[PDB]
Ligand binder design. Structure first.
Ligand SMILES: COc1ccccc1[C@H](Cn1c(=O)n(C(C)(C)C(N)=O)c(=O)c2c(C)c(-c3ncco3)sc21)OC1CCOCC1
Length: 482
């Protein structure tokens, strides 16, 4: 075998280009915790030293007074101002400044806050600090819903009917010229109603700079709701997109390195949604048959490659019961539900992020090699007979600084909830059915505490409906998610 005792040694062994010893976590709560546990576990496996990578957390006074756990957990911490996100966690200039001063070699922002802000990887890059996420050029291309959909369309990925249906760019960096935006947008209600005629109702009237989304059911209530999206986000171009019909939101999980290699990691399915929120996510997305899902994975990989994506991102689609599907978006970050994917794929995602930020290519990540059925520490490249998902995972959102829930019911279920009082439970079974029933048994146990009873019993029932056991897709028009 081989031995590495420090991050600098690891980089030499695994053909990387930047040594990361210390990471600044630009988040709190469960995200901070997850980042540290996932990376520490990989540190132990690799270096036999769980502290081989050090962590620095930012800490608001709210969190310091409370003695939130992530503080104790971290190697060193930096007090930051209280208030709303612009001060502290979503303040790019503050993040960079703290990163430069420590110093750290990279930043992980997770999800929330500043994770989607391209200024973050731009300002880090200029200051020579790594980002655990995609670079700003990729983040910009996906920043505008207009540029994003027409990029998708030029790769011949299916999209829903909309104001810029059929628009295309000539296809090293992909750009979308004024001409295309002008035809993809609607300037005013007149043009909106003309556009609405090619698309049909109901549609979303939506502002590409922003949240700022309205649902319109007819030509008669369009003008008011348009004037409303306009006045909500001033200066934004707006476009229109039709709703899907008998559909679910689903996601391909992509992982890319810094050399143009990208891999799909199965996907996720949102089987229950309410008021624009993900109540139940599943992995893999069994609702979609393989032949069709593999094509959605090929589409996401194409998209990821052409915008020059790095790190872990998700490609969101809409899937109809009649097998049709449509690109919606590339979310340029980890999501809170990512453990679903880790579990079924045996990929430690934040440790994959860390290694990729060190310039390690995909075929040198042990987890990826094993997934693709290769030796754990070989060096030969791999072309991304597909790997099989390992079992099935239900994740459920639970409701009414962080409390953990290790369930007595099963080693296969775990959850958490946070005061500033919502969270998730994650359940693994050998198949969908075992995963559901593990979940139910765990929630029955949750529902013993007075704080969760009312809300969890509601959830238990939801998981026990024939429509859920059968994985039926709701009829009618599909609402958007946040
Ligand atoms: C029974 O645990 C399951 C079941 C189904 C799916 C996922 C899990 C678990 C849930 N989970 C945890 O078990 N743990 C503990 C520490 C108990 C752990 N490290 O085993 C977690 O910390 C944890 C955390 C911090 C999770 C999380 N943080 C943010 C979102 O999810 S999910 C999760 O995710 C796996 C954790 C090990 O690495 C691969 C993911």
């Amino acid at each position: 075998d081989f031995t590495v005792a420090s991050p600098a040694e690891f980089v030499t062994r695994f053909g990387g280009d930047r040594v990361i010893e210390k990471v600044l976590i630009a988040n709190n709560g469960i995200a901070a915790v997850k980042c540290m546990r996932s990376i520490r576990r990989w540190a132990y496996e690799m270096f036999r030293n769980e502290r081989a990578i050090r962590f620095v957390v930012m800490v608001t006074p709210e969190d310091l007074k409370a003695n939130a756990e992530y503080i104790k957990m971290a190697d060193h911490y930096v007090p930051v101002p209280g208030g709303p996100n612009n001060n502290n966690y979503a303040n790019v200039e503050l993040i960079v400044d703290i990163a430069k001063r420590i110093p750290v070699q990279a930043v992980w922002a997770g999800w929330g806050h500043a994770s989607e802000n391209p200024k973050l990887p731009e300002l880090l890059c200029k200051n020579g600090v790594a980002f655990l996420g995609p670079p700003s050029e990729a983040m910009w291309a996906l920043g505008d819903k207009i540029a994003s959909t027409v990029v998708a369309q030029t790769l011949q990925v299916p999209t829903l009917p909309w104001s810029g249906s059929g628009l295309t760019v000539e296809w090293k960096r992909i750009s979308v010229p004024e001409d295309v935006y002008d035809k993809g947008c609607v300037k005013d209600v007149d043009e909106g109603l003309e556009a609405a005629e090619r698309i049909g109702f109901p549609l979303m009237i939506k502002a590409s700079e922003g949240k700022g989304i309205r649902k319109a059911e007819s030509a008669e209530d369009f003008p008011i709701l348009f004037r409303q999206v306009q006045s909500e986000i001033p200066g934004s171009p707006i476009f229109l997109m039709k709703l899907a019909q008998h559909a679910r939101h689903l996601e391909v999980q992509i992982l890319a390195d810094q050399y143009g290699n990208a891999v799909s990691l199965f996907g996720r399915d949102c089987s229950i949604q309410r008021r624009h929120q993900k109540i139940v996510e599943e992995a893999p997305a069994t609702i979609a048959p393989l032949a069709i899902f593999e094509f959605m994975e090929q589409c996401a990989i194409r998209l990821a490659k052409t915008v020059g994506y790095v790190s872990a991102g998700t490609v969101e689609y809409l899937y109809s019961q009649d097998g049709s599907f449509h690109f919606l978006e590339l979310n340029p970050r980890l999501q809170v539900e990512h453990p679903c994917t880790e579990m079924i794929a045996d990929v430690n995602l934040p440790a994959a992020q860390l290694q990729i930020a060190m310039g390690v290519p995909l075929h040198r990540l042990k987890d990826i090699r094993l997934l693709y059925g290769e030796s754990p520490w070989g060096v030969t490249p791999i072309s991304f007979n597909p790997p099989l998902a390992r079992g099935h995972v239900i994740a459920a959102r639970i409701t009414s600084t962080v409390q953990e829930l290790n369930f007595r019911s099963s080693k296969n279920v775990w959850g958490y909830f946070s005061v500033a009082q919502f969270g998730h439970c994650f359940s693994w079974g050998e198949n969908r059915e075992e995963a559901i029933s593990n979940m139910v048994v765990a929630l029955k146990e949750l529902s013993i505490r007075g704080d969760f009873r009312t809300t969890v019993e509601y959830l238990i029932n939801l998981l026990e409906t024939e429509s859920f056991q059968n994985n039926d897709i709701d009829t009618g028009w599909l609402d958007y998610l946040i």
